DNA sequence: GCAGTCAAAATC
DNA sequence: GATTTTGACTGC
């Protein structure tokens, strides 16, 4: 794709990126657009991580 | 200089 | 069309 991995995304969860103004944002998988989360790193990241838990509700596939 | 959203490019 | 992460843009 255009951007696979970045330095800021190294500390961010999936569906969450940081802008140039130090503001984080959550991208929706329905359209790819997003909204401002928070200017804190552990805050915006923690928020996107929770949503990822629900988004990951489906994963168990007969693991061993 | 913050606050909040959509486009850019490249892939499958 | 989907995705994935960064860039640009507007308003005060």
Number of E strands: 3
Overall, the morphology is globular
Radius of gyration: 13 Å
Number of domains: 1
Strand content: 15-25%
Looking at the overall shape, the CATH architecture is 2-Layer Sandwich
Function: Integrase is necessary for integration of the phage into the host genome by site-specific recombination. In conjunction with excisionase, integrase is also necessary for excision of the prophage from the host genome.
Subunit structure: Homotetramer. Interacts (via N-terminus) with the excisionase (via C-terminus). Part of the excision complex made of the integrase tetramer, IHF, Fis and Xis.
Family: Belongs to the 'phage' integrase family.
Organism: Escherichia phage lambda
Describe the 3D structure.
- By secondary structure, the protein is α+β, with helices and mostly antiparallel strands.
- The protein has a single domain, classed as Classic Zinc Finger (Double Stranded RNA Binding Domain, 2-Layer Sandwich), CATH 3.30.160.60.
- Helices cover 23% and strands 16% of the residues.
- The protein is built from one helix and three strands, in the order E-E-E-H.
- The chain has one helix spanning 41-55, and strands at residues 16-18, 24-27, 34-36.
- It has a three-stranded antiparallel β-sheet with strand order 1-2-3, covered by helices on one side.
- Strand 1 and strand 2 (24-27) form a beta hairpin.
- The protein is globular.
- It starts with 15 loop residues before the first strand and ends in a 9-residue tail after the last helix.
- It binds a DNA duplex (12 and 12 nucleotides) through residues 1-6, 8-9, 12, 14-15, 17-23, 25, 27, 29, 31-36, 39.
- Homotetramer. Interacts (via N-terminus) with the excisionase (via C-terminus). Part of the excision complex made of the integrase tetramer, IHF, Fis and Xis.
- Integrase is necessary for integration of the phage into the host genome by site-specific recombination. In conjunction with excisionase, integrase is also necessary for excision of the prophage from the host genome.
């Amino acid at each position: 794709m255009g951007r696979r991995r970045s330095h800021e995304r190294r500390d961010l969860p999936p569906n969450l990126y940081i802008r140039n103004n130090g503001y984080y944002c959550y991208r929706d998988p329905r359209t790819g657009k997003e909204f401002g989360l928070g200017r804190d790193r552990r805050i915006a990241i923690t928020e996107a991580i929770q949503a990822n838990i629900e988004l990951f509700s489906g994963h168990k596939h007969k693991p061993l």
